[PDB]
Amino acid sequence: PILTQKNWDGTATYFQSSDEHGFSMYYKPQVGFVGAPMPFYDPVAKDFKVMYLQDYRPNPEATYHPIFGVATKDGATYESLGELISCGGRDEQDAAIGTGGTIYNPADKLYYTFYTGNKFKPSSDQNAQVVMVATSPDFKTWTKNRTFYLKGDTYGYDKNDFRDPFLFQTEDGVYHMLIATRKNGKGHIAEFTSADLKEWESAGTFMTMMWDRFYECPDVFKMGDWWYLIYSEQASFMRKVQYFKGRTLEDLKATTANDAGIWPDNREGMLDSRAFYAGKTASDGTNRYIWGWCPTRAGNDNGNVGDVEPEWAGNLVAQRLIQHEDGTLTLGVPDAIDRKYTSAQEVKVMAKDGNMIESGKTYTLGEGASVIFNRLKVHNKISFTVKTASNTDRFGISFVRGTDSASWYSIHVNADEGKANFEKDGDDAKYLFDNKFNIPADNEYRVTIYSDQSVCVTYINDQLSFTNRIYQMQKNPWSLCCYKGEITVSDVQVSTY
Amino acid sequence: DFHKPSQNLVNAFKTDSQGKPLFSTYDNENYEVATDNVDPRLFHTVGMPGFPYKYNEGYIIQK
Amino acid sequence: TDAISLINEVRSRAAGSTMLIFNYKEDYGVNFKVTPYDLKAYAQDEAMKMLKWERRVEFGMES
Amino acid sequence: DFKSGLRLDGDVWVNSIRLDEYAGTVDYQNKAIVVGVPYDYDITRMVVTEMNLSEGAKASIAIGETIDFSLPVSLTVKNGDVQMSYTITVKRDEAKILTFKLNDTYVGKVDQLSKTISVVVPLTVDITQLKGTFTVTDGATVTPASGSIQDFTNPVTYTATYRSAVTPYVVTVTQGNVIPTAFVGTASSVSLLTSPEEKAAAQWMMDNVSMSEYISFKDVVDGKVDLGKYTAIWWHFHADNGDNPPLPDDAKAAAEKFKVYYQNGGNLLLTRYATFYIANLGIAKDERVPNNSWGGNEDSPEITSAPWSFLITGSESHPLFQDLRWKDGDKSTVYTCDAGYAITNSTAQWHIGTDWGGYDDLNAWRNLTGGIDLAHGGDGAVVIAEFEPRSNSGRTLCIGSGCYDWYGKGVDASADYYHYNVEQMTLNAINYLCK
């Protein structure tokens, strides 16, 4: 049997691609999906051991969401350590395991993982969520402490809202646990102090939430000279990841103490759009990496974002935290991910629909003009530079773009609105969501898209990070378009591996 | 064991507090026996788990 | 109005059809709430949607 | 030549286990070990003493382990390459009476929190020769014989015994062919009370409603009175001034007993500012208080001649809106306290809008709150709401309109010919809840 190879390079016709069950760069196990990442830095192995919850499409009704461990060292390569902590019985309090934290004790050479057990169909007198602990001697085998049950209602907190234990050790030598719970109708991040991680004292309330919202997966850390609190908003209308800044821990606590609204920056602490959730950070001592999950779309439709809140779990995504001189935080591509792309692919124009002109590597586009490039591959890195006429232009990058493509999915960087918008173009012209960022004063944009199969992350001049789930984007042409202003694109480079 | 009804049909049988079918939000969430008003025709058409099979207390449908 | 009257007749039959599942209220906490449509002027599309829903909830599982 | 060498011949049976000093009974049909312990015994730090498995079997738990047995504990017994999963449950000795019948009335308000039973058998049947049957969970002996002729004029005392568990029960049966109805106040009695608005409301209730009683939050908390005895309970909480005022601490404490009573199936009529209490009771699906709330001091209430009215569109057939005195043939508009009269803007309703509240339209409000909007405020506001039972629970009638008033600075409030609608609506609601 002689195999036939189609002319992939030379055609711009839309092609029905498919996603493999496994992912390499943005990790996804061959079985199940990643949810709620729990990063951790191993002081012994000097690597990153990120755990998560193994979600499935047909989740069992009672017991589900086990914990699976993933070892990495750079954020690009990932190996799987298998199931670490298994879900309990139907009647056990830990039938479903929620997000947790991990901390190493040199005192007894033990890894302690504090997770949240969810009671299946809890009764009136039964706490819905209880914090539990599992100990490991070598991070491989885990034994759950059956004598530890940190009930939320013991300290006057809500029974049904007691989640996300985050553990951190300060310089004074005492470990602090933050729990995102509810008190008398108000969202409170409560602090528990310990000296041996076996007995805890509730040291009041660490912080209060902003405008009766809920914070998911709190993460307090220190980056040089500021204290940062990364959290995920549980509100259906927001469903995003924000952060708070503070020179000291006291200043961070005083931030939003009572409807203060001390936003860290002018974009209300935005980091990424709707396609990034449960962002939790870990540092190896030289760099800080945040892990989250890009959600999947029901029916494999990029425009089917879904009502209220999107689908749970998805692909593990790792980004690098960048701290500016003013204390603001921005997300950047990991160095290993950037350097993994080695081979370079020649790029050439496919379609000439607009009034654009070509002068070599430079393409000048007016309003209503667009240019279509050649096909992409499974893993793509598209880097280019766009100079706009002024600070009120609307250019855009469109994927799943073909000669006969009825609809394509676009990211429009609107300078007049000062943001970017992920929308669906074509016969539907549907608006999906957006993300605010800082507009450069020189009208210069350095656009770098890193795409693995169907998950793509766009970086704009180290100021905007935009995660997207775009199915069928691999092995399909991509295009640049302009709608209102005048743009000039250059240095277009496509790298694959 | 063929011809199983669908959760879409169960949600369609689910009704609102005024006795009218939910014309736009019936399928947003699965029918809840304890909180959602339900048309009585559902218990004659579909046998849900935890309920008698064909009005027989000795055969309770289980999941 | 006559079509709405017929739909209301079917809905009233459904509401009264609780001779074998009356104990479900005290046995499994099942809330039965179905009421006839109000007799008033209705647009053609609204009447068609209401009729489609009535057919769906009446002849479900009946092929 | 064909066998896989998995060594499947092992046995994984569990003969018996002993927790501290209490042996467990093992049922192999459901793989359930049950360990009985005294009622006062603490099971949060139990210790495994022995576990006699089969030959070569190995269990997940080891002898001498300290376990918290507040919830069922899963155990896996493995022999070679076969395994079996058991569940261990430690039950404290309990003896709870489930159902009680006075030979004629299966229904009866029974609450185990106070170990009380209230029955409404009519007085026509002779009290002396009343026999009482009961159903109990298991193995519990009740000192009065089941179905035994006893006199029920006095509160009858029952004792349930099950090994080390001994519990009392107080049973009272009483009515005078009229169902009792209660009014809840802030504290103390009607005479010694603040809030003249609530004082006048309670006084009118006693004057009009036959066989009406008054109970206080402290009384319901400390058990002087039982909520299950009354069927309908009326609350007319009204703060002197301010918006969305916090509920009293005594009310917050009694919220648990009130929720138990509502689950038992008592009817509630809540008016004025006693509408934030549905959030505590869990009546509304949204678990959220009404968004709109403003207050004004009763010392200097506003006086306006504008004919404030309700706009009932499809709820004219509701028994609440019956025998009303409409000004004109427009039955949809219900006038109340028109012309110059002391009216305080103490209303608390919902807003049908999509710009500050999550109530974009009536369908969204109905789906989220899980109630029926009987009346509208004329500006897309739900002023009167009805909450039907969820699971054998009670029915709630929430009135959050500013037309609902009983006392004001104006003398002879009844001399308006339109304020009588308030009394008529209250009587209709009371009758509808009493059924």
Ligand SMILES: OC[C@H]1O[C@](CO)(OC[C@@]2(OC[C@H]3O[C@@](CO)(OC[C@H]4O[C@@](CO)(OC[C@H]5O[C@@](CO)(OC[C@H]6O[C@@](CO)(OC[C@H]7O[C@](O)(CO)[C@@H](O)[C@@H]7O)[C@@H](O)[C@@H]6O)[C@@H](O)[C@@H]5O)[C@@H](O)[C@@H]4O)[C@@H](O)[C@@H]3O)O[C@H](CO[C@]3(CO)O[C@H](CO[C@]4(CO)O[C@H](CO[C@]5(CO)O[C@H](CO[C@]6(CO)O[C@H](CO[C@]7(CO)O[C@H](CO[C@]8(CO)O[C@H](CO)[C@@H](O)[C@@H]8O)[C@@H](O)[C@@H]7O)[C@@H](O)[C@@H]6O)[C@@H](O)[C@@H]5O)[C@@H](O)[C@@H]4O)[C@@H](O)[C@@H]3O)[C@@H](O)[C@@H]2O)[C@@H](O)[C@@H]1O
């Ligand atoms: O603390 C303090 C306080 O407060 C509270 C808190 O909590 O709370 C409360 C609240 O509320 C709110 C509100 O409410 C109200 C309203 O106004 O009120 C209420 C109250 O008040 C009262 C008292 O009295 O009243 C008042 C009211 O009411 C009334 C009625 O109803 O009144 C009445 C009157 O009348 C009288 C006389 O005079 O009486 C009457 C009488 O008469 C009768 O009728 C007869 O007789 C009767 O009735 C009587 O008698 C008197 O008396 C009275 O007075 C009305 O009128 C008035 O109004 C009452 O009612 C009550 O009590 C007020 O007050 C307020 O305001 O508050 C606060 C505030 O705050 C705020 C504001 O709002 O909120 C917020 C927060 O929150 C939240 C959550 O948390 O958030 C959010 C927002 O936020 C933000 C910023 O920051 O935003 C954003 C987001 O969001 C959103 C959503 O939607 O987004 C969006 C954006 O957009 C966009 C961008 O992104 O766009 C785009 C699109 O795309 C496109 C298109 O297509 O594409 C294309 C291309 O490119 C283009 O074109 C474009 O682009 C997209 O993408 C998107 O969408 C926006 O829109 C929005 O926003 C973020 O960032 C953030 O988050 C929201 O939503 C929520 O809520 C903040 O902000 C602010 O500040 C709050 O908080 C609350 O809620 C307490 O607790 C304390 O104490």
Ligand SMILES: OC[C@H]1O[C@@](CO)(OC[C@H]2O[C@@](CO)(OC[C@H]3O[C@@](CO)(OC[C@H]4O[C@@](CO)(OC[C@H]5O[C@](O)(CO)[C@@H](O)[C@@H]5O)[C@@H](O)[C@@H]4O)[C@@H](O)[C@@H]3O)[C@@H](O)[C@@H]2O)[C@@H](O)[C@@H]1O
């Ligand atoms: O299993 C049913 C169906 O829903 C999911 C959604 O995740 O599972 C629900 C199940 O997941 C748990 C632990 O297994 O929490 C999920 C973990 O992820 C976090 C973010 O770090 O929560 C995000 C997730 O939580 C949601 C929906 O579950 O809201 C939480 C829910 O919990 C209440 O307390 C209910 O009383 C409310 O506060 C709120 O409605 C939603 O906002 C987000 O999508 C962590 O918080 C958590 O560790 C359990 O909390 C939950 O029961 C899917 O797996 C599955 O398809």
